[PDB]
Amino acid sequence: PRYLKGWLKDVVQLSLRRPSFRASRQRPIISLNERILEFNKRNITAIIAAYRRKSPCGLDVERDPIEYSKFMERYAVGLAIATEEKYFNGSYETLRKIASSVSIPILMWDFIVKESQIDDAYNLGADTVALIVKILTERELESLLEYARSYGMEPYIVINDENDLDIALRIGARFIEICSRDFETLEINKENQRKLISMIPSNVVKVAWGGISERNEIEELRKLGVNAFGIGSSLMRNPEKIKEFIL
Numbered sequence: 001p002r003y004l005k006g007w008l009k010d011v012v013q014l015s016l017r018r019p020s021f022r023a024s025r026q027r028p029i030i031s032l033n034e035r036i037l038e039f040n041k042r043n044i045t046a047i048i049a050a051y052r053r054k055s056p057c058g059l060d061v062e063r064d065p066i067e068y069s070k071f072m073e074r075y076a077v078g079l080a081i082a083t084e085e086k087y088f089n090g091s092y093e094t095l096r097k098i099a100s101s102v103s104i105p106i107l108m109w110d111f112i113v114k115e116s117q118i119d120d121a122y123n124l125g126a127d128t129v130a131l132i133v134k135i136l137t138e139r140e141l142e143s144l145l146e147y148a149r150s151y152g153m154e155p156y157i158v159i160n161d162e163n164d165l166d167i168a169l170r171i172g173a174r175f176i177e178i179c180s181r182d183f184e185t186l187e188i189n190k191e192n193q194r195k196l197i198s199m200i201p202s203n204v205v206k207v208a209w210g211g212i213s214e215r216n217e218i219e220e221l222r223k224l225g226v227n228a229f230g231i232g233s234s235l236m237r238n239p240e241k242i243k244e245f246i247l
C-alpha cells in the first residue's frame, strides 16, 4: 500500500496478516450500481444502509444483524457490511450470515490491500467490494479493480479529496463514493464533497457518504446528481428512519 500514518497504517498492517475465508459462494452476483441506476429511473430514493457495529471514531451499537438486514431488504438499494474487526467491530461471519438471509446487493466495507480479500468478498457472498484510493498505490488500485472485475463484481471506489478523484478517474472507476469524512482527521467537509461531486462525469455512479441524518441533504445531493446516499450510524441507532429518507 502507500506510506501511511496513525490508525490507517495499523488497520492496513493487520488486513495483510488477516487470513482468508475458503468456502464456495452460495448466491448470485447482484449488481448494486446497476440496481441504483434502475432506482433512479423508477424515481425511488436509493439508500445504502450500513451494518457497522462500531465507528472507526469509536462508539459501539450491538443489535441483531439478521433483524436489521431483513428489515433493510424491504427498503435499501444495497447493504454496506463493515467487516473490519479492530476499529469497526465487524467480521466475515456477520457478512456470510447476512448474505445468506438477504437477496438485495451487498457491499463489503473493508481495507482491501491484497487480492485474497477480493476472493474473501466473493466467497462470502458480497456483490461488490470497496477500494480506498487514500490507502493504495495507483497500480495496486488498477490491479484490485481488474481482479474484482474478473469475479463479475464492479468495485466501489472511495474518494476523499481532489487527489483521490484524480487517481479514481485515472484508474477507470465507474462506481464512486465521495466520502465527506477524511480518513485520518475523521472530519466532515460538505463543501469539499459538493465540489468533488460536480467534477465527477455523468456516466459514473455517485454515492454521497458522510454524516447524513436528514432527507433535505439527500434532496440537495440528488439536485447535484448523486445516484445513491449512504447512511450508517443514523440507521444503526434507528433503522426505521430509512422510511423517511425514502418518503
Ligand SMILES: O=[N+]([O-])c1ccc2nn[nH]c2c1
Pocket (backbone or CB within 6 Å): 050, 051, 052, 080, 081, 082, 109, 158, 177, 179, 209, 230, 232
Ligand atoms: O461502515 N460502512 O459499511 C461504511 C461504508 C462506506 C463508508 N465510507 N466511508 N465510511 C464508510 C463506512
